[PDB]
Amino acid sequence: PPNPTGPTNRQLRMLIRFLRKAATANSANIWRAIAELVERPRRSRVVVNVGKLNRVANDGDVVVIPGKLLGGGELKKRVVVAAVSVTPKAWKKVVEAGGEVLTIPELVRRNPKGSGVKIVI
C-alpha cells in the first residue's frame, strides 16, 4: 500500500516535534509515548468520548488524550483533560462536570515531568 507518510498538518508536525523535545529535556517517557500515539496514521488515530472518562478516570485525575476528545455519553466527574483537539460538546460536558480542558503543550508546561498523568486512548 502507500506506506504511512505521517501527518500533513504542520500544527500536528510541530506538536509531535514539541513532545519529543519535552521527553528528552525532562526524561519523561510519557511525552515520547504520547508523541508516538499522536503521529499514528489518520485511519487509526485515537478518539475518545467523554462517556469513557466516567469509567477510566475519577475526580481529580489529570488525563492526557493523544488524539481527539469527542462528546459522547455523559460526564459526571471532575477531571483535567488535555487533548490534541476537543469538540464543542466535549468541552462543554467536561467544563460543566467540574473539569477543565487543556492543550497538550499547556499540560507539559504545567507538569513538565507528567507525574501522575493518566493516558486515555
Place this chain on the structure above:
Amino acid sequence: VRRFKRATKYRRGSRTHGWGRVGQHRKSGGSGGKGMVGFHKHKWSLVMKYGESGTGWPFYGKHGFKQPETISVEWRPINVGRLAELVKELRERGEVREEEGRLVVDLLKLGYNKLLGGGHMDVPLVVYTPVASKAAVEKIAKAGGEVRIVSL
C-alpha cells in the same frame, strides 16, 4: 491529503506490467470466466472458506421467506440512556414543555417509534411511545417517570 504517482509510471520498461512472464495478462479465461461464475466448480474452495460447510448457503440456496415490507413496521428505537441525553439537549433549548411537573417527551414527534432499555435514566420523565420494552418501562419507572402507550 497526499498524492501518489500512478503504477503505470513505474511500469514503463517492465515488459509484463506486473502480470508476470509465465502467466501473462490474458482475457477472461485468466479470471475463470466472466462475472461471478465458477463458485460451484473451481471457485468452490472460496465458498467453502466463507459460506457454510456442506450447503454453501450464502452463495447458493434458499432460506426462509421475507415478510413484506409494505405491511411491516420500520422500527426506530431509542435507548433510555440515549433518551437521557436528548431530553437534556431539548431542556436547554426550551423545546420541552413541562406539563405534569415532570418533563414530557413524545417519541413520535421526535422521530422514534420504540423505547429500548440501554443505559440509565436519572430524571423523572413522561414518555409517549407506541412500543416500550420491558426493561425500558422499568428504568423509566425507577427514575420516577412513567411510560404511556399510544395506539396508532
Place this chain on the structure above:
Amino acid sequence: RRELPQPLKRLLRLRLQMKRRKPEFVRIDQWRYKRIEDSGWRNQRTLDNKIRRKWKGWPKPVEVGYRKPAAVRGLHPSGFVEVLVHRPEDLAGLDPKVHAVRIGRTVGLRKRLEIVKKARELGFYVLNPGKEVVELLKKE
C-alpha cells in the same frame, strides 16, 4: 583556482581520478545500431541481458558504487560552485570566493557585456563570457 580546505583538496584530486576511469554507460550493441547510438543508459529488463548480470568481458552496468565523493560532488573543475546568472541583478548574494558565475546561454550580447563588467569588478570568475564579449573587452 578556488582555494579549498585541505580535506576538500584531496577529494577534488580523487574525484578527478574517478572521472578519468569512469566507464561510459551504454546499452548492448549501442555501437552497432544507428537507431540507438545516441541514447542514454537503459537498464533493459530482458531474458539474456549479460550486462545486468555483470559478465566479464561485457559492458558494465550503472551502480551507486561509482558515485564520486559527496563533499566535492557537483563542483566545477576549478572547484567553484557554479551559479547560472541571467542578468546583473542576479549577482546579488554571491560570494566571489565560493561561487563562479555561468552566464545563461540565451542571454543577449548587450546584456552579457553589462553582466561581465559587473561580475569582473566584483572578483567573480566568469566561466563563459563568450567569444564576442571577449573580443569587445579585449578591444577596449
Place this chain on the structure above:
Amino acid sequence: PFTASAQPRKQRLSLYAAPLHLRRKLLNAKLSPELQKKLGVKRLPVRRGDTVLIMRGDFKGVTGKVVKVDLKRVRIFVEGATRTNSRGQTVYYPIHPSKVMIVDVDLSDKARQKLIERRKR
C-alpha cells in the same frame, strides 16, 4: 460585422473573410492635429487623393498623395514610397493604412462629408 469572440481563431477568421463593406473600417488612419481641429473628427478611412504622412518603416517621414487603395489586401500606395525593379520600372510599396497619418483630406466626394458629421457628433 467582426466577431466579438475572444478566441484568436475567430478574430482572424472574421478579418480575413470580412466582406468589402467591412474592410473599409480597416482603412482608418489618424488625422493630423491641424486636421483634427479643422474637422473635429479623430479618424477617417483613407481615400484616394488624401495626402498622408508615412509614420513607420523605411519611408517614414515621406508625405504624398494616395494613388491607390486595395480593399482586398488593405494596402495603400503613396508617391515617394516607391522603388525600381530589375527591369527599371518604378513600383509602389504597399503601406498598411494604420501606419500613416492623414495630413490632407480629399473631400470632393459628397458622401465623405456626411461621414464627417457622423464622427464629430
Place this chain on the structure above:
Amino acid sequence: LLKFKLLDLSPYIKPAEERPPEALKVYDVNGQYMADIETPIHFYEPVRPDLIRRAYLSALSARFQPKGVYEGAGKEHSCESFGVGLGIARIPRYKGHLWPRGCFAPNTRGGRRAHPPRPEKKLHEEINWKEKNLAIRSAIAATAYKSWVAARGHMVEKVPSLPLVVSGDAEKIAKAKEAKKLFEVLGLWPDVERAAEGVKIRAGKGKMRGRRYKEPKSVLVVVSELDVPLIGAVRNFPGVDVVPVSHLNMLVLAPGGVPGRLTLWTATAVERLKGLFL
C-alpha cells in the same frame, strides 16, 4: 477559547511572527491613519498551506470542461484482417483499392487513439463545505502577515500595515484615475506596477488557444456589497481583483494554491466579515 487554534509551543519551540493585532488599523482615502477596529475571528486562524492548496485546487478544477475525441475516429473505415499466409502482418487492412494499407489499429497511421480522453471523466475535485470554509478563513488570516504576502511575491515595502483596511468612503470612487491615487497613497501602486511589467507572452501552445498572455496578481480589493462604484473603478488594473466580502473564495485568496494575497479591505467589509465563512 482559541487556545487550540493558536497553539503555544514554547519553550521547546521558538515562537514565530506574532498573530494579527487585536485592533485593525483604518486609513482614510487620503492615506492617513484615522481609527482602529477590532480584528475579526477569521484572522486568528492558523495559516495552513496544505489545506489552502486543497481548497484552491477544488475551486479551480470545477471550471474545466469535458474534452474528448470523435467517438468514431479511426473506426469508420471498411477494413478487415486477412489472416496469415500473405507474408504480411495480420493487423486490419483496407478492403478496397488501398488493400495492403493498415487501418483501425492504434499503431497504424489513421488508426484509432488507444486510450483517448473521455468527456465523462470527472475533472472536478469535490470538497466538503465546512472544510472549504475553514480554508477560506485560513487564507484570510494569511493576508494579515507580511511574511506570507512577501512570500507569495507581492511588494509590501510601502504598505503601512497588514491586514490593510481602508475607510468605507473608498466605495464611492467611481473613476480609475481616482482609484489609482488611493493605491499610490496607500503604498499599493508598486505591486500593481509589478503586474503591469510582468505580463509575458507565455511559452507553448496556449498562444494558439487564447492564452497568449500571462499576467501576475497584484491586489485583491474587498468591498462590502455588490454593485458599489469602487468595483468598476479598480477592475481594470493589471492583476487587481475586486469582490464583495460575501463573494470571497479560494481563487482570489490564494492564487497558485499558495497563501497570502495583498488585500485592501474596506472598513465596512470587515464588519460584514464577522458573519460569513464560519
Place this chain on the structure above:
Amino acid sequence: MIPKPVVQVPRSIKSGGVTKWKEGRGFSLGELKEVGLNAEQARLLGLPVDTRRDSVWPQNVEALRKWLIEVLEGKATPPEPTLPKVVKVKRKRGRAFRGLTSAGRRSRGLISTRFRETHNYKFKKKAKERRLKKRHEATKGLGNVLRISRIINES
C-alpha cells in the same frame, strides 16, 4: 405573497406513526367554502384549487383569510388566474398508424394499466438508462457483485 396549501403526507404502515407535512396540490373545496369562494372564484383570484381533496385544515383556512383580506383591501396584487390561457391543438396525421386510436391504446395497455407500467414504457425507460449509463445501469451485474462481496466481507 400567495399562500401555499399545507397537506398531510400519507401515513404509511411502514412509518410506524411518524408523520410529516408537505405542500399539497391545492386548496380543498371545504377550505374554500369557509372563506366564501368556490373553485371558479378561487381560480379567478389565482389560488390553486384541488377539487379532489376532501380534508380541511385550519392552517390552510387562516392563510387564505389573511391573504384574502390583503387582496380585498388593495394591499396585495393577485397573480394571474389558475385557468388555461392558451389553446393549442395540433392537427393529427396518421393516428391509426401511430397506435393512437382506441384499438391502439388497448393494444398498448393504456386502458388496463398506467403509462409507467405499460410495456412500451418499460422498453424505452431501460434503453435511456443504458444509453446514458444512469443509476443502476452504469454497472451490469451490480446486484450480484454486491451480493457476493457482502458474503466475503461479512462472513
Place this chain on the structure above:
RNA sequence: CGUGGGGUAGGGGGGCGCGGCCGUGGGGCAGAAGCCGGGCCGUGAGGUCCGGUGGACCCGCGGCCGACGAAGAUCCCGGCGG
C-alpha cells in the same frame, strides 16, 4: 551500530524527461525554438555551457493535470540502400 552490500517474477521507496494549467522570476532581432559538432556536471534517467546554422519565441523554481518516454509487434506510414 550492522560475521550491511548478487538477484529474475513480484512487492515497497525515491528521482529524470515530455505537453498543458495555477503561481513566481526571468531571457530573446546585441538573435528564441530547432539542427550539427564539442567541453563540463551527475552512478543514472538527464542538465548545462561553447562554436557553427537558424530567424521568434522560450526558460529556472513551487504546485497540479495528462492523448506522457520505444529497438523489436512477419508492427503502420514515408524515404532510401546492398
Place this chain on the structure above:
RNA sequence: CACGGGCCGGGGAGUUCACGGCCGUGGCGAGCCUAAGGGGUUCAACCCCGGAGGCGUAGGGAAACCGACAGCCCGCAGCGGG
C-alpha cells in the same frame, strides 16, 4: 541449425465510469454529507440556500416477535515507590 527485424525518420499499447475492498492524508464528529433543484454573481467558475435521502448510532430470528455491561482477573506502555 528455435522464431522476428534491410536501414533511418515519425507513429505505436493499464484508459474512463460505476460499484466493492483496502491504504495515505484532510474536514467534521453521535453524527457526517447533501442530490436534483433555487437565488445571486464580475455568470459552466464563485457565494448562499436546498437534509429528500444515504451511511452510523442495536442485535437476534424464516417469521410472528423480542431487544443488551464496569463485576472480576492477567497484563504491555505509562505513572508513582524502593
Place this chain on the structure above:
RNA sequence: GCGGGGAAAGGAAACAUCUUAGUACCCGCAGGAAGGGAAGCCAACAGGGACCCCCUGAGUAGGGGCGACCGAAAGGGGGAUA
C-alpha cells in the same frame, strides 16, 4: 418521437430455459418536439389528489437452469402547473 415485425454473435468459462434484447435491423406514421395527461387511482381507517421529466426509494420487493443475470411501484424532494 410514435406503432408493428424482429435475430445472432457473445455471456452463462460446454449448452438448450435464460441473457444479449424488444436490442441491431426492417416496415409504417408525425412534430418542432413527440408521446403521456385529468381516478372504475394510490393508500390504510391517517391521508394524498391529472400528466411528463430530474434526484431518491433501489439493485429494495420480486423474476430466474433461484444460475448467469434481470428488476419495479407506492412514497419523499424538485422543474412546471390547467
